[PDB]
Amino acid sequence: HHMAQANFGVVGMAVMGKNLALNVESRGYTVAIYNRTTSKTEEVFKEHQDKNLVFTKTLEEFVGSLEKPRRIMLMVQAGAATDATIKSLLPLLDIGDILIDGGNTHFPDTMRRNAELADSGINFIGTGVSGGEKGALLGPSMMPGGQKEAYDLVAPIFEQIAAKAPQDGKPCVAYMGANGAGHYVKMVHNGIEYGDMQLIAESYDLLKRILGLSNAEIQAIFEEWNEGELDSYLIEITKEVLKRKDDEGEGYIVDKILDKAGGTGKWTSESALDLGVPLPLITESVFARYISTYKDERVKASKVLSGPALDFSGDKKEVIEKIRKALYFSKIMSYAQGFAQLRKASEEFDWDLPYGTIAQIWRAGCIIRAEFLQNITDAFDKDSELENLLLDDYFVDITKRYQEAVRDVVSLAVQAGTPIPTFTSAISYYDSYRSENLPANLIQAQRDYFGAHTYERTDKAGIFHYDWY
Amino acid sequence: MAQANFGVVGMAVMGKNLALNVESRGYTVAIYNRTTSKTEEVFKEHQDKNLVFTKTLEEFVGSLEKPRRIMLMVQAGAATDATIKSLLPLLDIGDILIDGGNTHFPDTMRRNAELADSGINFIGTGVSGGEKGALLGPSMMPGGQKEAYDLVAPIFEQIAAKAPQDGKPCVAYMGANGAGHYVKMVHNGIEYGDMQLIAESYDLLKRILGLSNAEIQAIFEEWNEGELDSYLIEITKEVLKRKDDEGEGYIVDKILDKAGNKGTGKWTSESALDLGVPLPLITESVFARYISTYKDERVKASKVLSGPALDFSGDKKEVIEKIRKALYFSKIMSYAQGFAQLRKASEEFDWDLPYGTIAQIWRAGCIIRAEFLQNITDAFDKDSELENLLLDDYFVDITKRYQEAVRDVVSLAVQAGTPIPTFTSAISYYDSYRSENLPANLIQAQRDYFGAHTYERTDKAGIFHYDWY
Ligand SMILES: NC(=O)c1ccc[n+]([C@@H]2O[C@H](COP(=O)([O-])OP(=O)(O)OC[C@H]3O[C@@H](n4cnc5c(N)ncnc54)[C@H](OP(=O)(O)O)[C@@H]3O)[C@@H](O)[C@H]2O)c1
Ligand SMILES: Nc1ncnc2c1ncn2[C@@H]1O[C@H](COP(=O)(O)OP(=O)(O)O)[C@@H](O)[C@H]1OP(=O)(O)O
Ligand SMILES: O=C(NO)[C@H](O)[C@H](O)COP(=O)(O)O
Ligand SMILES: [Cl-]
Ligand SMILES: [Cl-]
């Protein structure tokens, strides 16, 4: 009926896949659509009859509708369902065809699928797609990985549909590297999102608990903060949330929302542990959510555990600014950690990850978009082999000038009893990373004492075991 | 040569010493190692003992009285898998195979199921106390079928350490399949946490108070007489005595500050992340080791990243005492975290772990032997479903009284620029745990704003979504 007439194909007509399909169609292409449950594909075709969509009832019809090399994008449920869908397609595809998985996929799955499909002569592009439903429709940040020759054939469409960066119109997509490099970068992006959210949460909690500020007051502070170097979409979201009234009562909706946070957030931290990378801030943020889910225990504990009962006496304006600095500083700690993880992963899996570009493509179509991403890109433009962001001139100056405030904020908060797990982690990482010598000599001694694990010395090469008895 | 009542495979530090422990209880012990020269060394150095030198597995298996009792202390992972694979075909129905290495519990769980109907009884056990523990009395944490346990319980009790308090052996049934190796994994997690807390304390005494190793040794010596009385503090004061064996000065000052690890701490943090358990103190200590391995980077950073240079001008005796309190306070938080994880693990894997007994068997032959273990046991006798140690009167009281000192120590450390990731994690955990309300309400608002993830309300049951537009 429409044999080899479609330029691009999408499997999965839930909102994301539908939205992507429409994004692609809007760019001047005929797009074949498929969904396991056909009624859903019917609904899409019926309400978009004016578009160049090709309605397909079966995988055979779907595959047959596409020009070769076939470019097919999976937007189906992650895990077993994506493997089922891949397995369903394999027999119909020709050698040289290109499958693309745009689901939030754990990267080792992508690495396996890519390898297995390559034995069948099928290219596999594991692609991270940020921005949610609106992003899929209008412009996502995309992080593709897989065979470079295949990706070069998909690139034009991705660059056309991707979010364009507001500062220079550059598409928020680029080739990340082989096999699972694409979904790896997306994972780190999701970790980073968790960390940015927890840091804003602490900033909010300090302003509320210690300085006693109202929601309107805190809204104003975030607004003012967002006009400076902190400029970020998450802060914009935050000051918007603080405006809104309760839809089923009096006051503000944010004060009615139960503090039990909602999975896959653990992935970045899991890889960090596996790779030997210190990723304390994002991992503390994950654990911040976990402990909020222990609400019932905290209610009990709030009634028996003691803590300080202070009324703040200092200068409110001075401390608000000290908190502002602590936020930017700590956010910088988290990104340094996250890009150091990316560096290790790149060595481990041999991906030559393009670090400056990753920051560039996060400038739009994703929740972590912020202006200071440009400073990250500046840093790797200057030196692609930069081991850690903290060593670049810009970030050296920031930390030199902001660390004092961080410290005052930590003393203030800890003395008052306000929990600040990420802020405290930030300054602990700064003071660890810059320590020429750490007390790990003592740990090594202990391990040798009880376990005979051996150690290295400071004055000569070799492996040594002391006789402690 | 069927003289042998017990058999040990692996003649590195742990297996050699376990063999000698068992032989000293009045048994003849078969010994085997893959490199034969090691087995030769221990045979020749102990001709007075009743050991059977074997050079093949066929010989080793042949030398044991049926039903055979064979214990492996082999390098974890692939080596252990292969050793067992080689050994299984030689074994007879009724024989008992014990894996006493630090095996990742999923491997043991898999092994148990595979061996279920083989007629070969299987036990995966944790072993504590290091080389001297193995020689004189280890704490042991075995899991498997209860029937298998009961066949090795008698000899386990004989070799086990005996608690000084009541003479009770430091071994007990932990539960089904991988329960034992899981409990040992948490043990090591708790241990990483205390080791890092001790290291931080050392760092504070050395860098802020400016104290010599003699002065610091004396301090830890006094602490060990009080409520801090523990294995790790005991050996810490021993390490700080010893002088360099290949030069002048103290050995601890000649050991390179690159902390090694063999995966048990990492595994604990990974299980916490999978299970939804907040485990910041222990995880921060794993990351503290990871950052110690980034020595080259830290040397580079220390020349570029600036920080405070304050001179402690206060009362040293008073600050030392605050550090003590803080250390005991934080030690407790590590344990409270560990047991909270054991509770969640027990539920997930249907193990019904005996929390109170675990504490009992850690009273000797145990790297994490501490004075307050009975208070842990008391707390669980009182309430079997106790959710967290911090809810028990005993620990409520300690935290009430020492909490102020933790805050002064954190504040002093942070103003001085000395990294204290585990101390800051401790008070952050405490302050989060006792918080009835945390700022996860803002996180949920944000998530519902950008992804429509839904939220619970503070005032009514049900799932809600807000129309943010
Ligand atoms: N050391 C401690 O403080 C301590 C405490 C508690 C538990 N553990 C656990 O107990 C077990 C043994 O510990 P350990 O410290 O005595 O020594 P280890 O270094 O972990 O293991 C060495 C033993 O494993 C064998 N082995 C190593 N690689 C092998 C391979 N690729 N294939 C076959 N066999 C191999 C060695 O034989 P060869 O001599 O021929 O190389 C040797 O007998 C480990 O699982 C460890 O985690 C250790
Ligand atoms: N086992 C499976 N095999 C093939 N496709 C599947 C699948 N499970 C889910 N999907 C597809 O995966 C899509 C939904 O995945 P998802 O969990 O990411 O959804 P959403 O993002 O809407 O929550 C749907 O198109 C679904 O097809 P149906 O519309 O027929 O349900
Ligand atoms: O189980 C043990 N002692 O508890 C072993 O010595 C173990 O190897 C110690 O952990 P680590 O070697 O990862 O530091
Ligand atoms: Cl590839
Ligand atoms: Cl996003």
Chain B residues touching residue A404 (CB < 8 angstroms): 308
- Nearest residue, CB atoms, A446 vs list B236, B245, B418: B236
Q: Half-sphere exposure of residue A260, counting CA atoms within 13 Å on the CB side? A: 15
Name the burial class of residue B63, with classes exposed (0-12), middle (13-18) and buried (19+) by CB atoms within 10 angstroms of its CB. Answer: buried
Say which of A18, A170, A186, A325 is annotated catalytic.
A186
A298–B459 C-beta distance less than 8 A: no
Q: Determine if ligand 1 sits within 6 Å of the CB of residue B124.
A: no
**Alpha-helical segments (H) within A38-79:** 38-47, 59-64
**Alpha-helical segments (H) within B208-306:** 213-223, 231-239, 251-254, 264-275, 280-293, 295-302
CA distance B339 to B341: 5
CA distance B234 to A290: 35
Q: Determine if ligand 1 sits within 6 Å of the CB of residue B36.
A: no
Residue whose CA is at the smallest distance from ligand 2 atom 22:
A14
CA distance B277 to A291: 7
Extract the tokens encoding A198.
Answer: 């927890």
Extract the tokens encoding B26.
Answer: 């009045």
B 424-453 residues inside an 8 A Cβ radius of A: 424-425, 427-451, 453
Chain A residues touching residue B205 (CB < 8 angstroms): none
**Which atom of ligand 3 approaches the CA of B188 most closely?**
4
**Which atom of ligand 2 approaches the CA of A36 most closely?**
30
Q: Half-sphere exposure of residue A323, counting CA atoms within 13 Å on the CB side? A: 25
CA distance B388 to B335: 10
Name the burial class of residue B237, with classes exposed (0-12), middle (13-18) and buried (19+) by CB atoms within 10 angstroms of its CB. Answer: middle
How far, CA to CA in Å, does B448 sit from each of A219, B236, B238, B454? Answer: 18, 50, 56, 5
| Approach to solving | X-ray
Q: Determine if ligand 2 sits within 6 Å of the CB of residue A81.
A: yes
B 317-336 residues inside an 8 A Cβ radius of A: none
Q: How many residues does chain A have?
A: 469
Kindly list the structural domains of chain A, giving each domain's residue range(s) and its CATH number in brackets, ordered by start.
Answer: 1-183 (3.40.50.720), 184-436 (1.10.1040.10), 437-469 (1.20.5.320)
Q: Determine if ligand 1 sits within 6 Å of the CB of residue B51.
A: no
Residue whose CA is at the smallest distance from ligand 2 atom 8:
A81
CA distance A355 to chain B (A): 18
B459–A288 C-beta distance less than 8 A: no
CA distance B352 to B179: 9
Ligand 2 centroid vs B274 CA: distance in angstroms?
A: 24
- Vertex A430: Cα angle to A426 and A433 (nearest 5): 130
- Vertex A42: Cα angle to A39 and A45 (nearest 5): 160
**Which atom of ligand 3 approaches the CA of B126 most closely?**
1
Instruction: Identify the CA nearest to B129 among candidates B118, B120, B140.
Output: B140
The ligand placed nearest to the CA atom of residue B73 is: 1
- Residue A107 region, left (φ>0) first, then alpha (ψ -120 to 50), else beta? alpha
The full DSSP string for B366-434 is -TT-BTTHHHHHHHHHH-TT---GGGSHHHHHHHHHHHHHHHHHHHHHHHHT---HHHHHHHHHHHHHT
Strand partners, A66: A6
Instruction: Identify the CA nearest to A442 among candidates B15, B352, B253.
Output: B253
Task: Please say whether the dihedral angle defined by the alpha carbons of residues B11, B15, B17 and B23, taken in this order, is positive or negative.
Answer: negative
Chain B residues touching residue A276 (CB < 8 angstroms): 290, 293
Q: Is B85 a catalytic residue?
A: no
Q: Is B191 a catalytic residue?
A: yes
CA distance B347 to A46: 49
Extract the tokens encoding B196.
Answer: 């890092």
Contact at 8 Å (CB) between B413 and B422? Answer: no
Q: Helix B213-223 crosses helix B231-239 at what angle (to 10 degrees)?
A: 160
Q: Determine if ligand 2 sits within 6 Å of the CB of residue A77.
A: yes
Name the burial class of residue A81, with classes exposed (0-12), middle (13-18) and buried (19+) by CB atoms within 10 angstroms of its CB. Answer: middle
A463 shares contact with chain B (CB less than 8 Å): no
- Nearest residue, CB atoms, A446 vs list B232, B446, B468: B232
How far, CA to CA in Å, does A62 sit from each of A35, A101, A117? Answer: 10, 17, 19
CA distance A22 to B59: 72
Instruction: Identify the CA nearest to A206 among candidates A398, A415, A370.
Output: A415
Map residue A14 onto helix, strand or coil: coil
Ligand 3 centroid vs A409 CA: distance in angstroms?
A: 37
Extract the tokens encoding B73.
Answer: 């202390």
CA distance B205 to B446: 43
Cis before B280? omega within 30: no
Extract the tokens encoding B343.
Answer: 């509770």
Instruction: Identify the CA nearest to B18 among candidates B119, B175, B155, B141.
Output: B155
